[PDB]
Design an enzyme around this catalytic site. Structure first.
Site, short mmCIF file in Angstrom:
data_model
loop_
_atom_site.label_atom_id
_atom_site.label_comp_id
_atom_site.label_asym_id
_atom_site.label_seq_id
_atom_site.Cartn_x
_atom_site.Cartn_y
_atom_site.Cartn_z
CD1 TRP B 51 -0.24 1.21 3.25
CD2 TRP B 51 0.03 -1.01 3.42
NE1 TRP B 51 0.32 0.94 4.46
CE2 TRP B 51 0.50 -0.40 4.60
CE3 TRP B 51 0.10 -2.41 3.31
CZ2 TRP B 51 1.04 -1.11 5.67
CZ3 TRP B 51 0.66 -3.14 4.41
CH2 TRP B 51 1.12 -2.47 5.57
CG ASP B 70 4.21 -5.48 4.91
OD1 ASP B 70 4.37 -4.37 5.48
OD2 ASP B 70 3.10 -6.02 4.74
N1 C2B Z 1 -0.70 -4.21 7.43
C1 C2B Z 1 -0.69 -5.06 8.65
C2 C2B Z 1 -1.38 -6.37 8.63
C3 C2B Z 1 -0.68 -7.59 8.66
C4 C2B Z 1 -1.33 -8.84 8.59
C5 C2B Z 1 -2.73 -8.91 8.47
CL1 C2B Z 1 -3.51 -10.42 8.33
C6 C2B Z 1 -3.48 -7.76 8.41
C7 C2B Z 1 -2.75 -6.39 8.48
#
Ligand code: C2B
Ligand code: C2B
Lengths: 358, 122, 356, 109
Positions: B51, B70
């Site tokens: 995002w 990430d």
């Molecule tokens: N963006 C954080 C995040 C990580 C994992 C899950 Cl399942 C949902 C949101």
């Protein structure tokens, strides 16, 4: 303008690194190793270890070894017990070594997952629940020997003065010594005379380990020794940790990995608490006592900061202590230890910390 | 210009959720996890997708596009958890949305930590 | 009394389901089952990495959605739906999914079922979005609705056996009507309901038998009516009076709205000092709106709640602040707090009643 | 009383009390499987002044209950007295060894 990259190595030199084994008991399927810099408290990285992981660092300092249990669907499906080899600097998975599905599932005492002094074999505790010791050949990457001779015994104490020998503590109050051949199978074995009364003066399994001897402390504050300078282990004890003033307040040892030896000085470190009685053997440390193992006398005592486990670095004259969540770093160059710093929130539920070998 | 390079800032500044480029971070800051603002901790893998946030830099008065890639394939780092939502939008504006795992398309989708990568001017 | 083999000790009508993401240890998410009448913990269902959960319409089964890997952080991925017995809390059946089920926070709309109970309807993201259809009886993934690309979340239509809607990036709704086999029979797209750039809505519906209401980042209300063959949309009307506007009251939360169908009362989590970035703030207050008169009929302390759910028959609202569940009597316009269940989860944004 | 770690029968529990997890002192929560093996504690009953053997069969195959965690060590001994030892997982031999909660079953005097 910028691009995210991976493939990186741990930022701090190996000599700065410690390993905090976080069982994460509340969510035990997501245990992990946290890697910290003990000089400044910096978080360096981590290694995931699934259900109730155990960990050690290879004697040569190049690799991290873990031991864990997987199931195809975690709470159902086929079980796989393994040892994993990870690169120490990249903190990446390299290899899995299959184990029979009986590796010990339990709290992280050092003696459940060890190696021979020559670093050629990983030596681990099995429980099916019948006990045996498992041997993993590091060069082959295979499980090579189930030491069924160790039935009724518990934990692995490597002998630092021999390449592939170790001892275990048996239900008869003695020690069984196992000498492996170059193939990792039992070449010979021997059993000591009774060291301690199992019923009357049970010892903690954690050794205060020297080059050629090991000391053990008892539930009632006694000290026992096993000398393995020769082929047959000679046992002795008890002497008491307590002097007459100490007896008044019922001082006794307590903790998990609760002792350590500074080999150059012969100083043994032990977690102690007052008001000892039945059921207090895992109580947090009110104090750390420092004993001269030659004179059989206490030389120092300091506040324990509720510590439960410790480890010692011989070369840098350091002791780490751990209360479950926080790690304390002490300079033990002199008889009275000096607190250098505390690393807060190093784990949620850790009873084991270890140095990177240097 | 100095505020455009996190590597030159005080570690306590960049490790804080109020650091200007962390304005749409939902997860653990990789800079607290053995990595840096723009590098994954050892043994964790960058996500190719993310995002994107638009964040104001109060040090130079300009607005910047930040890509929230990430680092993946290790379990949760657990440190410096942030939940900031500046200009974040729901899943019908999917690449502005941070309640999904941006590790979703990695070889191993376990979420370890989040980085805040400078794309350029908004 | 035997040692194992037991069923849940409280009657189904007392049960609620708290989906604990356990975000700090997200590979050990689980569903905690509670008795809302006394706060008793009744059991749990493990759900691995970022589980989602719902209870079958007939009350007999629990359905979970999750992701496994052969070695958790490495090895082959398996996305699955699992069917569990609701009373025994035991695993029955795994249904294979393509490896693109949504990994995300537990909005109700990511994991739903048709009114007739015959299909599970779930959100995918690869990151391209599609909606997946699972035939419960056959235990099979049967249809990938790629027509829903650019849309997000599933809103079942309680007046039809196997129809649902999704919210799309044009500000409208796509309706999908399934055939007897679960493949798409027909579909339709509404006119624009809301401006995506100027007045984005929260995805959570305040859902009636043939209409759904939605609240916006700036405190407006939009509606979709599906009594007819095609969906009709309208809005905005504002939740805010002049005093409310001057204090910058706006909605905030996750599963942040609910509808009491008999009365037409809509429940919404609200906070003051709204500005860009406050849309997920915990509730300062719960507001209760009469959707017919378009007036607020009550406002009560929010207890920092983030998510809620409603039980029609017992006139109940549950709210959830991430760890604690509050139970409200909503039989009258002003809700009354009945109790709080402390420590129901470590990181939950979704609670649901067992259907009765 | 039975949900308290100080309850006399819980004198060698290192785990979560099943009575807080949807089971009872002597029964597993729904969908968790009893262990066939266990460690045993020797606990003093304050009501009759007698000591009783208590078997701590775990319930297994579900992840950690997390409620009513206890760590009592009366008469507990290390692993060289293996069936008196509570720092190991007594779910270790179950079809699924994941630890859920612990029961406290009265065996006898
Ligand atoms: N963006 C954080 C995040 C990580 C994992 C899950 Cl399942 C949902 C949101
Ligand atoms: N008896 C509790 C317990 C369970 C699991 C492990 Cl690994 C250790 C101790």
């Amino acid at each position: 303008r910028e691009v995210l990259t991976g493939g990186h190595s741990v930022s701090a030199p190996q000599e700065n690194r410690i390993y905090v084994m976080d069982s994460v008991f509340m969510h035990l399927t997501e245990s992990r190793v946290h890697v910290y810099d003990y000089t400044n408290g910096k978080f360096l990285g981590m290694v995931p270890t699934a259900f109730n992981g155990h960990v050690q660092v290879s004697n040569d300092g190049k690799k991290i070894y873990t031991m864990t249990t997987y199931h195809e669907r975690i709470t159902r499906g086929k079980r796989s017990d393994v040892v994993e080899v990870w690169d120490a600097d990249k903190l990446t998975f390299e290899k899995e070594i299959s184990l029979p599905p009986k590796r010990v599932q339990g709290l992280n005492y050092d003696g459940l997952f060890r190696q021979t002094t020559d670093g050629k074999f990983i030596v681990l505790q099995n429980a099916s629940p019948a006990t045996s010791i498992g041997i993993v050949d590091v060069a082959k990457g295979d499980y090579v020997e189930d030491v069924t001779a160790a039935a009724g015994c518990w934990s692995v104490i490597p002998q630092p003065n021999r390449p592939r020998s170790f001892m275990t503590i048996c239900g008869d109050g003695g020690l069984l010594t196992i000498n492996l051949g170059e193939d990792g199978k039992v070449a010979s074995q021997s059993r000591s005379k009774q060291m301690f009364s199992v019923k009357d003066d049970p010892i903690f399994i954690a050794p205060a380990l020297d080059k050629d001897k090991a000391h053990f402390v008892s539930y009632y504050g006694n000290v026992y020794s096993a000398d393995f300078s020769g082929d047959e282990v000679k046992v002795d004890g008890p002497w008491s940790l307590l002097n007459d003033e100490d007896k008044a307040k019922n001082w006794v040892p307590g903790g998990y990995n609760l002792v350590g030896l500074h080999r150059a000085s012969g100083r043994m470190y032990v977690f102690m608490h007052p008001d000892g009685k039945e059921g207090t053997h895992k109580f947090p440390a009110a104090e750390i006592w420092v004993m001269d193992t030659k004179t059989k006398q206490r030389v120092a005592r300091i506040p324990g900061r509720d510590a439960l486990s410790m480890t010692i670095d011989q070369q840098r004259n350091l002791m780490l202590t751990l209360d479950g969540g926080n790690v304390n770093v002490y300079d033990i160059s002199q008889p009275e230890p000096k607190l250098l710093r505390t690393i807060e929130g190093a784990a949620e539920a850790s009873l084991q910390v270890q140095f990177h070998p240097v | 210009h100095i505020s455009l390079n996190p590597d030159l800032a005080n570690e306590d500044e960049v490790n804080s959720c109020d650091y200007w480029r962390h304005c749409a971070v939902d997860g653990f800051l990789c800079s607290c996890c053995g990595g840096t603002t723009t590098t994954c901790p050892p043994g964790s893998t960058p996500s190719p997708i993310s995002w994107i946030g638009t964040c104001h830099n109060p040090h130079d008065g300009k607005d910047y596009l930040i890509s929230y890639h990430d680092c993946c394939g290790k379990t949760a780092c657990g440190r410096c958890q942030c939940n900031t939502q500046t200009r974040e939008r729901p899943g019908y504006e999917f690449f502005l949305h941070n309640d999904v795992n941006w590790c979703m398309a990695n070889e191993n989708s376990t979420f370890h930590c989040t980085t805040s990568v400078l794309v350029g001017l908004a």
